């Protein structure tokens, strides 16, 4: 009755028009779950591998017919017959079935698709909301969102090194209001960009990549839009964060942060020690609450110095530093590097391992920030994961494009359902600080 009778994958498209897959799970009783998988770029060899077809005549080699076949031909027969509620047993079964460390045989996308589909089918079976199924009875914290409002780095032609600039409505009373604050600042910013004759078309995540003069111009324009929408810049209103993605401009063989990469030949070329100083400059100069990948993915002492210097004032998120991998998170914790981790579900491949990463972080006093990918789908599972774990934060995009807005809407539904029980922690989300 609760027993899984069908597991079926198919090829669909992500928010960038590139193939991905979805899986559907049915129980004998007819309970249904669908899991869609986002795109996963790979950073190193120590991460779940998304399986692509490689046939360059078709979708530029980005097809997923192989992963789909793996679900239908290998995984389905293995998993069919399990109770839909045995999430852990099922995920482990799939890890063993693949038998390789990076889930490269069956594909991390095939495995995750099934993991999510089973969880959602289980919730449907039990007739409870997904966050309840994942987290148990004590789910209640709506996440303070960090919203990608301006893009730099490779996602831009402006002389800015940092990949993302985000706003966080840490001063809002509820998620619903916080979401409105973000939306309003976003519309004010669009208005400001039009006035300056800058481009208001959006990137993968719904933000702008305007031809600013440099990093200071960008930040100051965000501050402009924050004031224009009528909110405070600070802990009582809206604060700012970075995804530096500094690995993208780290010279491995010179061991220095080379800004000329993205900011032209006048740009600074900084040693780790100087990288930490520049970040500190910005933190003193601006209402910065969070900084992601401020150091290089393998610059472990650089991370240690940064954490020593700002770790008590600022959230420091390891994204490529940790790649949702508890082996790396464990070392960060031991070595006092970072105080936050970016959780990308498909960077690891199962919900079970995902939640293990979230718990390891939390128990070390680190925050876990559930994250979108560049290629998204109409799925909003990470909304439920964020609430399920009372994580307190989420990173799921700017305030346009349904590939982002779907998560925000789902969060609205969850808040609405929790009623008086819902909590929004704002600045108190940062228990790592």
Numbering used by the authors: 1 to 433
Can I see the authors' text?
SEN has been proposed to contribute to the virulence of GAS by serving as a plasmin(ogen) receptor. Although SEN has the ability to bind plasmin(ogen), it also catalyzes the conversion of 2-phosphoglycerate to phosphoenolpyruvate as part of the glycolytic pathway inside the cell. Alpha-enolases are typically homodimeric, however they have been found in some bacterial species including GAS to be octameric, consisting of a tetramer of dimers. Each subunit is made up of an N-terminal domain (residues 1–143) and a C-terminal domain (residues 144–435).
The crystal structures for SENK312A and SENK362A were determined at 2.15 Å and 2.10 Å resolution, respectively, and were consistent with the wild-type protein in terms of octameric structure and packing of secondary structural elements. There were, however, differences in the subunit interface area when compared to the wild-type protein, with the total buried surface area for SENK312A and SENK362A corresponding to 24,230 Å2 and 23,070 Å2, respectively (the corresponding value for wild-type SEN is 24,912 Å2). K362 forms several interactions in the minor interface that may function to stabilize the octamer. Each K362 is within hydrogen-bonding distance of up to four other entities: carbonyl oxygens of T389 and N390 in a nearby loop on the same protomer, and side chains of E359’ and E363’ from the opposing protomer. Although no significant difference is observed in the SENK362A structure in the vicinity of the substitution, this mutation is expected to make the octamer less stable, because both the inter- and intra-protomer interactions are affected. The melting point of SENK362A however, was reduced to 51.1°C, indicating that it was less stable than the wild-type protein. Size-exclusion chromatography in preparation for mass spectrometry showed that while wild-type SEN and SENK312A eluted as a single peak, SENK362A eluted as two peaks. This is consistent with the mass spectrum of SENK362A acquired under conditions where non-covalent interactions are preserved, which demonstrates that there is a mixture of monomer, heptamer and octamer present in the first peak to elute, indicative of a solution state equilibrium between these species. Surprisingly, two SEN mutants bound more plasminogen than the wild-type protein, with the percent increase in plasminogen binding for SENK312A and SENK362A corresponding to 196% and 341%, respectively. The higher activation rate of plasminogen when mixed with SENK362A is likely to be due to an increase in the amount of plasminogen present in the tPA-susceptible conformation induced upon binding to SEN.
